[PDB]
Design an enzyme around this catalytic site. Structure first.
Site, PDB file in Angstrom:
ATOM      1  N   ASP A  30      19.267  34.020  35.915  1.00  0.00           N
ATOM      2  CA  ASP A  30      20.569  33.384  35.979  1.00  0.00           C
ATOM      3  C   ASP A  30      21.653  34.367  35.516  1.00  0.00           C
ATOM      4  O   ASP A  30      21.386  35.494  35.089  1.00  0.00           O
ATOM      5  CB  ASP A  30      20.577  32.061  35.222  1.00  0.00           C
ATOM      6  N   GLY A  86      23.986  33.991  33.147  1.00  0.00           N
ATOM      7  CA  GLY A  86      24.389  33.876  31.764  1.00  0.00           C
ATOM      8  C   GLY A  86      25.585  32.978  31.541  1.00  0.00           C
ATOM      9  O   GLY A  86      25.809  32.535  30.401  1.00  0.00           O
ATOM     10  N   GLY A  87      26.319  32.642  32.601  1.00  0.00           N
ATOM     11  CA  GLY A  87      27.577  31.930  32.429  1.00  0.00           C
ATOM     12  C   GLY A  87      27.413  30.527  31.870  1.00  0.00           C
ATOM     13  O   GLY A  87      28.234  30.076  31.063  1.00  0.00           O
ATOM     14  N   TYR A  88      26.386  29.799  32.314  1.00  0.00           N
ATOM     15  CA  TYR A  88      26.232  28.416  31.869  1.00  0.00           C
ATOM     16  C   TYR A  88      25.952  28.355  30.376  1.00  0.00           C
ATOM     17  O   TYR A  88      26.584  27.582  29.643  1.00  0.00           O
ATOM     18  CB  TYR A  88      25.092  27.729  32.618  1.00  0.00           C
ATOM     19  N   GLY A 144      26.462  23.008  39.786  1.00  0.00           N
ATOM     20  CA  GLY A 144      27.304  21.952  39.260  1.00  0.00           C
ATOM     21  C   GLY A 144      26.707  20.569  39.304  1.00  0.00           C
ATOM     22  O   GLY A 144      27.436  19.596  39.072  1.00  0.00           O
ATOM     23  N   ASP A 159      14.298  24.992  39.370  1.00  0.00           N
ATOM     24  CA  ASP A 159      13.862  25.394  38.043  1.00  0.00           C
ATOM     25  C   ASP A 159      14.273  24.307  37.073  1.00  0.00           C
ATOM     26  O   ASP A 159      15.281  23.627  37.286  1.00  0.00           O
ATOM     27  CB  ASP A 159      14.529  26.683  37.548  1.00  0.00           C
ATOM     28  N   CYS A 165      -5.597  15.879  38.224  1.00  0.00           N
ATOM     29  CA  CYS A 165      -5.119  17.236  38.013  1.00  0.00           C
ATOM     30  C   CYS A 165      -6.262  18.232  37.914  1.00  0.00           C
ATOM     31  O   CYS A 165      -7.236  18.010  37.195  1.00  0.00           O
ATOM     32  CB  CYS A 165      -4.319  17.240  36.713  1.00  0.00           C
ATOM     33  N   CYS A 216      -6.037  21.270  36.653  1.00  0.00           N
ATOM     34  CA  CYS A 216      -5.755  22.338  35.704  1.00  0.00           C
ATOM     35  C   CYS A 216      -6.877  22.483  34.675  1.00  0.00           C
ATOM     36  O   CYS A 216      -7.705  21.594  34.472  1.00  0.00           O
ATOM     37  CB  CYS A 216      -4.392  22.154  35.022  1.00  0.00           C
ATOM     38  N   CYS A 233      -7.098  19.746  31.891  1.00  0.00           N
ATOM     39  CA  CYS A 233      -7.709  18.491  32.295  1.00  0.00           C
ATOM     40  C   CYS A 233      -9.193  18.637  32.569  1.00  0.00           C
ATOM     41  O   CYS A 233      -9.907  17.634  32.581  1.00  0.00           O
ATOM     42  CB  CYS A 233      -6.942  17.928  33.487  1.00  0.00           C
ATOM     43  N   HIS A 252      -0.699  22.246  31.272  1.00  0.00           N
ATOM     44  CA  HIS A 252      -0.877  21.093  32.140  1.00  0.00           C
ATOM     45  C   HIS A 252       0.409  20.753  32.893  1.00  0.00           C
ATOM     46  O   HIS A 252       0.385  20.510  34.099  1.00  0.00           O
ATOM     47  CB  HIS A 252      -1.377  19.874  31.383  1.00  0.00           C
TER      48      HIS A 252
HETATM   49 ZN   LIG Z   1      -3.877  18.983  33.984  1.00  0.00          ZN
END
Ligand SMILES: [Zn+2]
Ligand SMILES: [Cl-]
Ligand SMILES: [Cl-]
Ligand SMILES: [Zn+2]
Lengths: 372, 372
Positions: free
Chosen positions: B92, B94-96, B219, B269, B307, B309, B312, B338
């Site tokens: 990004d 940096g402005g925000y 915005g 994101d 899931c 992952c 899990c 997860h």
């Molecule tokens: Zn998971």
């Protein structure tokens, strides 16, 4: 595999190297046990603990009995299943942390009552400690004893040692009266007696008469300093049965480990690599460094120049410096993995040097460089 | 691989699926970018981020320019080398975070001066933002803009959009005047205009005239709520060039992602999976759960029943409940892995359903179950 078999493969002076075979795995000795404070080796998955070379971890009973509770862990399938570590676990008895961490403690010949560090009330006795360790599913169970502060007068050291030996017999009988525990776990007794040779001898004799699978040297690393600790080990370890493992609880720094092995110790645990790692101290063969120091801010070298751990293969001192100074979780993760891996590499070098009859030279070379 | 090539492989309504090819890797779209707040996706090694399926991460410029500093990171070899992530990174501007996190801010047509959230003083302009992103070695560089709070009057929204478009041209020229950056990185412009269709159109026209590699809808997700966000997306996304990626910054919850894809967004994101994971919120196909709730204390099921992952596969809700309530680092690690894996599985299901012409049905099925 058997319930318990300790075999000594090689010896050099008082130092020994060998194996403990248990149902859940083989433990190479001399061994260092990473500490799981409450069902986790802090900041590491169990697979990472194993990848560093650890064969066994220590679980603290005091914390587990408070949260999540021993009965709950048993209902959920035991500590191994709960945390995801399927190899041996040694559990302490809970007695030390009742005295160091809890409040409202009341001691008696029966045991100790105390308030949780939530204010809830709880009890611990030889029988209840052994039961909790059973509910957790511990592989190596520690007898419940009464710790002796340092310094201690001869009278107080004697009284606490004598009580601890009475409690060692109660621990033995509690363990043996639970068939599943007696058939699948091992029980270690703890030698007490402060710095006094005659009390250490009486304690060793009492423990050997009861009979245990291994013997800890208790009551050290509590403020006496290395010279005094080594002096007490010099006479205390030979009093224990030679053919069983010797466990020095709560030790320690790398040089303490090396000197204790030179004096016949086979097993160690300490929070130093994990706790001090999260604080910024990294172990190296050239001595410890504090990674937060500004001198590391642009240092692209790994934490240690020889370490084979994944942290030293992938990230720089500069990055870890940044992470620790920023309070980032990954900083704790990387420092802890490296420090535990360093400890395991130390133990491997100790084992190989004893096995090759060059441990005295290793100890000398290690010190010369570590303290340069 | 080319510097930048976006290819659309399949479409359903306004939704698209395809790939962005860049020198450091391929990005599958629609894409979710885990957020690295300051050179780390909190509580995860980069290899774990990759194992969840992420193709690209976001780095926050504001934090990095304060600590460790952009020039220091450049001296150390750039952000990719420093943190150990070798795939694309979007930064990004940096402005925000200057406006949300810093103090003593003074805005002008040149840029913004501000005090660090250490009290040190710093400046940010289109030129300096592009330079910092170059020093970090960003693959996708965000133009520096002036954010518009919600709600905003038409006059203020117009003034800030107009300034942002002047700054978009300055960002374009700064990026193009650095040969290494222009040849190896990509530059995205940001549409502004608050909730006002005419301002959104003027902004899209200005950005298209300058020309960018991708276009963000800026915005939004600043307090207007999902209905209003979707209403603005309905008219705003069609104004952007169809043949370039559309990036919705700072979004969001799973349902926001699904609805935004239905409206033509290709990239996302958000800190929600990482930050809220450390706080105890786990995403599941049946909606989010707060793992700290007592109802999970003895629940042996995984966080989510489908899931794939590693969390899990290996640990229970009960264990993670315990870890989070104890403040253990491993709790943050497991919850974050997860949640990021869940987000990547969501994006994969979105991509596959668009590729198969059944995304409308997926969105309906997803909502019916997630909000049951
Ligand atoms: Zn998971
Ligand atoms: Cl610790
Ligand atoms: Cl975060
Ligand atoms: Zn290392």
């Amino acid at each position: 595999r058997p319930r318990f078999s300790f075999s000594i493969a090689a010896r050099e002076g008082k130092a020994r190297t060998g194996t403990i075979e248990m149902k859940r795995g083989v433990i190479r000795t001399p061994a260092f046990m990473p500490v799981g404070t409450a069902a986790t080796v802090k900041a590491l998955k169990p697979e990472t603990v194993r990848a560093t070379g650890a064969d066994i971890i220590l679980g603290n009973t005091y914390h587990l009995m408070l949260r999540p509770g021993a009965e709950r862990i048993a209902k959920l399938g035991g500590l191994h299943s709960f945390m995801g570590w399927d190899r041996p676990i040694l559990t302490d008895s809970g007695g030390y942390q009742v005295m160091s961490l809890s409040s409202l403690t009341k001691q008696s010949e029966e045991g100790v009552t105390f308030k949780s560090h939530d204010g809830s009330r709880h009890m611990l006795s030889p029988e209840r400690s052994i039961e909790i360790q059973h509910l957790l599913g511990s592989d190596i169970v520690m007898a419940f004893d009464e710790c002796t502060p340092y310094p201690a007068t001869p009278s107080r050291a004697a009284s606490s040692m004598e009580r601890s030996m009475r409690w060692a017999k109660r621990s033995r009988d509690a363990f043996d009266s639970r068939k599943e525990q007696a058939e699948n776990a091992a029980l270690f007794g703890i030698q007490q007696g402060s710095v006094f040779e005659n009390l250490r001898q009486q304690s060793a004799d009492a423990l050997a008469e009861i009979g245990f699978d291994g013997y800890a040297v208790g009551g050290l690393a509590v403020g006496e300093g290395q010279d005094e600790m080594f002096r007490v080990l010099d006479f205390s370890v030979p009093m224990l049965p030679d053919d069983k493992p010797h466990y020095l609880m709560g030790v320690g720094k790398p040089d303490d480990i090396v000197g204790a092995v030179e004096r016949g110790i086979d097993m160690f645990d300490c929070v130093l690599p994990t706790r001090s790692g999260r604080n910024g101290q990294a172990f190296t063969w050239d001595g410890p460094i504090n990674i937060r120091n500004a001198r590391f801010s642009e240092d692209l070298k790994p934490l240690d120049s020889e370490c084979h751990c994944a942290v030293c293969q992938k990230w720089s001192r500069a990055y870890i410096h940044f992470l620790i100074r920023a309070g980032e979780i990954l900083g704790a993760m990387l420092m802890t993995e490296h420090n535990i891996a360093f400890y395991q590499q130390l133990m491997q070098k100790i084992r190989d040097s004893i096995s090759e009859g060059r441990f005295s030279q290793f100890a000398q070379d290690f010190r010369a460089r570590y303290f340069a």
